[PDB]
Design a protein around this ligand. Structure first.
Ligand SMILES: CNC[C@@H](O)c1ccc(O)c(O)c1
Ligand SMILES: [Hg+2]
Ligand SMILES: [Zn+2]
Length: 256
């Protein structure tokens, strides 16, 4: 199936998922001098106080921290969004080296990693129906740079040993995603897609300008994870990012 290798990577995805070459694919390069301040943007509202994490899963491409979305708890609203979007999961994309890993880029700059907090529009009842809609999803993107450790990330880092290989999962309750946010909620926004097959064009992207810093030791543990399943030859889970895709006359708006 699809992956990130020479033979199954982003360059191959279009064969099974023709939308890979579509009109609103992600990620994209954010050209800071082309993005326009949008005064019609409402303030962004990130309400994660009542968030209920359930478990962490290695799915063979990344790891997902999943949340209970059976009622309005962790929600994203405001900014470019209309209505309420519920947090369902978060995951990261990262590199084999610090100089690469992020999916979105800023004036062609690649960060060491990128965090995606995935939310679905409550108007559509559930995630499965939301991904059939042009405004079905909102993803909050946060860049990671290597520097000081991120205290709020360590709980995730420590559990990774227990989910080394494809298909493994661990109980992961009472994790607070507020510990992953930078200070400023300044962002760029554009209409786009899921960055993994099947690459569905249902996402309002909200990409925070301010990166969070994580320690070299924290990122190193991400890189210890495996793409393969248990008892299979070791394939380190690294460089699980899609590169920047054509903007196609979409407009990136800045909140600041
Ligand atoms: C339904 N919740 C989405 C999450 O579990 C998810 C993450 C990455 C994927 O490739 C995928 O098919 C699903
Ligand atoms: Hg869609
Ligand atoms: Zn992602």
């Amino acid at each position: 199936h699809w992956g990130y290798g020479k033979h199954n990577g982003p360059e191959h995805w279009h064969k099974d998922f023709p939308i890979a070459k579509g009109e609103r694919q992600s990620p994209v390069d954010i050209d800071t001098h082309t993005a326009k301040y949008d005064p019609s943007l409402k303030p962004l509202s990130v309400s994660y106080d009542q968030a209920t994490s359930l478990r962490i899963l290695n799915n063979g491409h990344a790891f997902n921290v999943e949340f209970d979305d059976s009622q309005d708890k962790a929600v994203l609203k405001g900014g470019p969004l209309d209505g309420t979007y519920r947090l369902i999961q978060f995951h990261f994309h990262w590199g084999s080296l610090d100089g690469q890993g992020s999916e979105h880029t800023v004036d062609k700059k690649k960060y060491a990693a990128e965090l995606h907090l995935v939310h679905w529009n409550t108007k559509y009842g559930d995630f499965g129906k939301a991904v059939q809609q042009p405004d079905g999803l909102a993803v909050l993107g946060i860049f990671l740079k290597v520097g000081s450790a991120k205290p709020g990330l360590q709980k995730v880092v420590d559990v990774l040993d227990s989910i080394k290989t494809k298909g493994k999962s661990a109980d992961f309750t009472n994790f607070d995603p507020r510990g992953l946010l930078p200070e400023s909620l300044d962002y760029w926004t554009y209409p786009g897609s899921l960055t993994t097959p099947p690459l569905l064009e249902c996402v309002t992207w909200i990409v925070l300008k301010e990166p969070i810093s994580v320690s070299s030791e924290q990122v190193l543990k991400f890189r210890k994870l495996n793409f393969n399943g248990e008892g299979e030859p070791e394939e380190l889970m690294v460089d699980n990012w899609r590169p920047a895709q054509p903007l196609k006359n979409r407009q990136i708006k800045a909140s600041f």
